[PDB]
Amino acid sequence: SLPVLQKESVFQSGAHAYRIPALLYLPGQQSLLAFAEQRAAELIVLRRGDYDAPTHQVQWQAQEVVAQARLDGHRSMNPCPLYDAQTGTLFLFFIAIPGRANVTRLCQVTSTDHGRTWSSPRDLTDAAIGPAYREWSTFAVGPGHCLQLNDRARSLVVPAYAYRKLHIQRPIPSAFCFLSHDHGRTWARGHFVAQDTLECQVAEVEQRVVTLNARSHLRARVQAQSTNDGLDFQESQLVKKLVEPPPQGCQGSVISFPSPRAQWLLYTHPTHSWQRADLGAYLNPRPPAPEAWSEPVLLAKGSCAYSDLQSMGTGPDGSPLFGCLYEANDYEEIVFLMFTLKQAFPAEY
Ligand SMILES: CCC(CC)[C@H](NC(C)=O)[C@@H]1[C@H](O)[C@@H](C(=O)O)C[C@H]1NC(=N)N
Numbered sequence: 001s002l003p004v005l006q007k008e009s010v011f012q013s014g015a016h017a018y019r020i021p022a023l024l025y026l027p028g029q030q031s032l033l034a035f036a037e038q039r040a041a042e043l044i045v046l047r048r049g050d051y052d053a054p055t056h057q058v059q060w061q062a063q064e065v066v067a068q069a070r071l072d073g074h075r076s077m078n079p080c081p082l083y084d085a086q087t088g089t090l091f092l093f094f095i096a097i098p099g100r101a102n103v104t105r106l107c108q109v110t111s112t113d114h115g116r117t118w119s120s121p122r123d124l125t126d127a128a129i130g131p132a133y134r135e136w137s138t139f140a141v142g143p144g145h146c147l148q149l150n151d152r153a154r155s156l157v158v159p160a161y162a163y164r165k166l167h168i169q170r171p172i173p174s175a176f177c178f179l180s181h182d183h184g185r186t187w188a189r190g191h192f193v194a195q196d197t198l199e200c201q202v203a204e205v206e207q208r209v210v211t212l213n214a215r216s217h218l219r220a221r222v223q224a225q226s227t228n229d230g231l232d233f234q235e236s237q238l239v240k241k242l243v244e245p246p247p248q249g250c251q252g253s254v255i256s257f258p259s260p261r262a263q264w265l266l267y268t269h270p271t272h273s274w275q276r277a278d279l280g281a282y283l284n285p286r287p288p289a290p291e292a293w294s295e296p297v298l299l300a301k302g303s304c305a306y307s308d309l310q311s312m313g314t315g316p317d318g319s320p321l322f323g324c325l326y327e328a329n330d331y332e333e334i335v336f337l338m339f340t341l342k343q344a345f346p347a348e349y
Contacts, residue, residue, distance in 0.1 A: 001299070002339070004299075004338060006058060008060070008336050009333045009335050011333060012333040012334075013333065016042070017040075019036065019037050019331055020078060021034065021035065021306060021325040022079045022080060022143055023308040023323055024310065025083075025312050026083060026115075032048075032050075033081060034334075036334060037076070037078075041076065043075075044069045044079050044094060045063050046064050047061060047064070048060070048064075048116075053316055058323075058336065060336075066109065068119060069092055070096065070121070071123070073098060075096070075097055076094050076095065077094065077097070077143075078141050079094050079143060080093040080141045080142035080145065080146050080158060083148070084154075085154070086148075086154045091110055091146070091184055093146065095141060102136050106128055106129070106139075106178075107121045135165060139163060141178070142159060142160070143308075144251075144308040145255075145310065146158045149204060149229055151229055153182070155229060155230075156179070156184055158179075159177055161200065174197050175197040177212070190226075193212065193224040193233040196216060197215070197222050198248070199214065199251045201213060201254055202230065203254055205256060205288060206262045209226060210225065210229060210233075211226075211265065212224045212230075213252060213254045213267065215244070215249040215250065218244055219244050221238075221249075221252060222236065222238060222239070224236035224237075237290065239290040242267070245272065245273065250269065250270055251307070252268060253267065254268075256311070260320070260341070265284035265288075266281065266283055268299065268307040271298070276303060277303050278298055278301055279304030279328075283344070283345050283348060299324065299339075300328065302328070307324060307325060308324070308325045310322065310323035310325075311323075315340030315342065317343075319349050320340060321340050322338065323338050324337035325337075
C-alpha cells in the first residue's frame with residue numbers, strides 16, 4: 001500500500017510479549033522514544049531512536065527497561081510519554097495495579113538526560129484524584145503521548161478515563177484530563193466528557209481549543225473539545241466518519257501539525273468496522289470540525305491495533321514528517337512507520 005520513508009519493527013514476540021506502544025519526539029535531539037509494555041502487563045521498556053534525514057531513516061538502539069517506572073508488587077501499564085519544551089524535562093506517566101474497590105495507582109518518573117536515566121516514581125494518586133477516588137473502581141492514562149499547552153503557564157495535559165460507579169449496574173467510564181499548571185508539581189482533575197468514553201488523547205488547535213478523541217463501546221469514535229484548557233469539554237459527539245470495531249472499540253491516536261496553508265489533525269486507527277485490521281490515517285484540515293474529517297488512507301494492510309502518532313518536523317520532501325507506532329500481526333510485533341503529509345495526502349499538500 002501507501003509508500004513511506006520507513007517501515008520497521010521495533011519490538012517483537014519471543015522471550016516476552018509487547019503491547020500498548022507510546023511514541024515521543026525530542027525536537028532539539030532529532031531523536032524518538034518508543035515505549036511499550038513488556039508482558040511476561042508487567043514492565044515498561046523503551047527503545048531510543050536517532051533519526052537521520054539524509055538516509056530517510058531512524059536508527060534504533062538496544063531495548064531497555066524503565067527500571068524506575070514501577071512500584072513493588074505492582075504491574076505497570078499504559079505508558080504516557082510527554083516532553084516539557086519549557087524545562088526540557090521528560091515525563092513518563094503510568095499506572096500501577098497490584099499482583100469492586102479501587103486499587104489503581106497513578107505514577108510518574110522523570111528524566112533530565114533525554115530519557116537516558118530516570119528518577120524515583122512519584123505516586124500522584126491521592127493528591128491528583130482526592131475523594132473521588134473511592135467513587136471509582138479504576139482509571140487509566142493514555143495510553144500514548146500526552147500534551148503541553150501554549151497557555152501562559154505552558155500547562156501539562158494528561159489524557160485519562162475513570163470507571164465511574166454511578167450505580168445496580170457496572171461501572172460507566174468517562175474520559176477527562178489531569179491538569180498541572182506548574183510543570184508536573186501539582187495535579188488537578190478536569191471534568192468528564194460524555195459517559196461511556198475510554199482511552200483517549202488530546203491535541204491543541206489554533207481561539208485556542210483542546211480536541212479530545214476517545215475510544216468507545218459504540219461503532220464510531222467520540223470527540224469532545226474544550227475552550228478552558230481541558231478543564232471542561234462542552235461539545236461532545238459521535239464522529240460517524242471514524243469507524244470503531246465491534247467489541248469495545250480500539251485505541252486510536254491523534255496529533256496536530258502546522259497547516260501548509262492554524263493546525264490540522266492527523267489521526268490513526270483501524271479502518272475495518274468489523275475488526276482490528278487495515279490501519280488507516282485520517283486527516284482533518286478544519287479541526288476540530290467532526291465532518292471535516294477525511295476518508296482514511298491505508299497505512300498498513302491487515303491486523304492492526306493500538307497506535308501512537310508523533311509530529312517529527314519537516315520531511316525530506318518539504319512536507320510534515322510523521323512518526324507512527326502501532327501493534328501489528330495480532331500483537332506479534334510493534335511497527336514504526338514514518339512518512340509525510342505528501343505521501344499520505346497527495347491531494348492535500
Ligand atoms: C479494562 C480497560 C481496557 C481499556 C479500554 C484495558 N486497559 C487496562 C489498563 O486494563 C485494555 C483493553 O482491555 C485491551 C485492548 O482493547 O486491546 C488492552 C488493555 N490495556 C492493557 N492491558 N494495558
